[PDB]
Each structure stands twice: as C-alpha cells, then as structure tokens.
From a paper:
To gain additional mechanistic insights into Tsi2 function, we solved its X-ray crystal structure to a resolution of 1.00 Å. A molecular model fit to a 1.68 Å resolution electron density map was used to calculate phases for a 1.00 Å data set collected from an isomorphous crystal of native Tsi2–H6. Two monomers interacting through extensive contacts were modeled into the crystallographic asymmetric unit. In the observed Tsi2 dimer, the long axes of the two monomers are arranged approximately perpendicular to each other and the molecules pack via their coiled-coils. This interaction involves a large (725 Å2, 13% total surface area) and predominately hydrophobic (68%) surface area, indicative of a physiologically relevant interface. In agreement with this, the molecular weight of purified Tsi2 measured by gel filtration chromatography was found to closely approximate that of the dimer (calculated, 19.16 kDa; measured, 19.46 kDa), and we observed strong interaction between Tsi2 monomers using the B2H assay. Superimposition of the Tsi2 monomers showed that overall the two subunits adopt highly similar structures (Cα r.m.s.d, 1.1 Å). Interestingly, modeling of the electrostatic surface potential of Tsi2 showed that residues in the vicinity of Glu38, including Asp23, Asp45 and Asp49, generate a prominent negatively charged surface feature. From these data, we conclude that Glu38 and Asp45 of Tsi2 are major determinants of Tse2 interaction. Taken together with our screening data, we conclude that the regions of Tsi2 important for Tsi2 homotypic versus Tse2 heterotypic interactions are topologically distinct; Tse2 binding occurs at the face of Tsi2 opposite the site of homodimerization.
The T6SS of Pseudomonas aeruginosa is a complex machine that the bacterium uses to intoxicate neighboring cells. Among the toxins this system delivers is type VI secretion exported 2 (Tse2). In addition to acting on competing organisms, this toxin can act on P. aeruginosa; thus, the organism synthesizes a protein, type VI secretion immunity 2 (Tsi2), which neutralizes the toxin. Our structure of Tsi2 shows that the protein adopts a dimeric configuration; however, we find that its dimerization is not required for Tse2 interaction.
Numbering used by the authors:
A (entry chain A): 2 to 79
B (entry chain B): 2 to 85
The structure:
Amino acid sequence: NLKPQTLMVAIQCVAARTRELDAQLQNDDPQNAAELEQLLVGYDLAADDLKNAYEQALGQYSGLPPYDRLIEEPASLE
Amino acid sequence: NLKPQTLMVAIQCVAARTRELDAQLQNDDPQNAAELEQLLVGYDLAADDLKNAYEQALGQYSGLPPYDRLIEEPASLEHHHHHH
C-alpha cells in the first residue's frame, strides 16, 4: 500500500504539471495544444483516483493535510 | 487502489517535477538549494514507492511498459542536426 506521503507528493506533482501545461496552451501551436488537452483530461482522471485514495488515507492516518490544500496553486505564482 | 493509468501519470509527473528541480539546482545561483534538496528527497521517496506499486499492478503477462521507460529522461532520446 502506498504511503500517505507518496500520495501527497503525487497529488502535488500532478496538480503542478497540470497547471504548467495549461499555462502554456494559449501560446502553443493549436495542433500541439489540442493533443495536450487530451493528455490533460487523463491527468484529471489520475488526479481523481489519487483523491479517492487520499480520502481513504485521511480515514486511516493522522497528521495529513486536507486534500484541497495539496492541490492549491501556490501563492507566489498567483 | 490506484489504477495502472493513474500510477503511470503519477510516475511521469513526479519524474517531470524532479527534472525541473534538478535543472534549478544545476543553474547558476540556486536559491534555497538545501530546501530544494529536501523536496527532492521526498520526491525520490515517493518515486520509489510508486515504482513498487506499479510493479505490483502488473499482470503476469502485462502489456504495460517497463518502469524504466516511464522515468527515462526525454532529452536523452533527442538528436539534433543542422543541414549541411
């Protein structure tokens, strides 16, 4: 079983890549952006599966932050 | 449970973010390098755990790719040549 710290890092990294790829779509060649757009739906499906696993972890383990905190866009970027 | 597809995305996103942090550490004047290194320890630990989970996810005759293919450095596969 994956450790809760692992779930946290995965959640954070999938959220960060999703943001980074989204940010550049506007400038990207439309052909490329369209293909990324489809990859990014796949990222969101993965993100949902990770959330479900994390919610199970929140019922098992203490000392974990709320899900919405993990995926929050960092203040220094917004 | 995590689906195989979810594990692949997680593995590849952790690897991508790891590469981004490594590039920052290699550039001039990394700020808070010790702290970037702390983040990388956690990244590495998650990566190892995800690796183990991915191996667990594979059937005996899986179609899914080797783990090493998921984490390989993209630039390492590129070749670049101008026209003569």
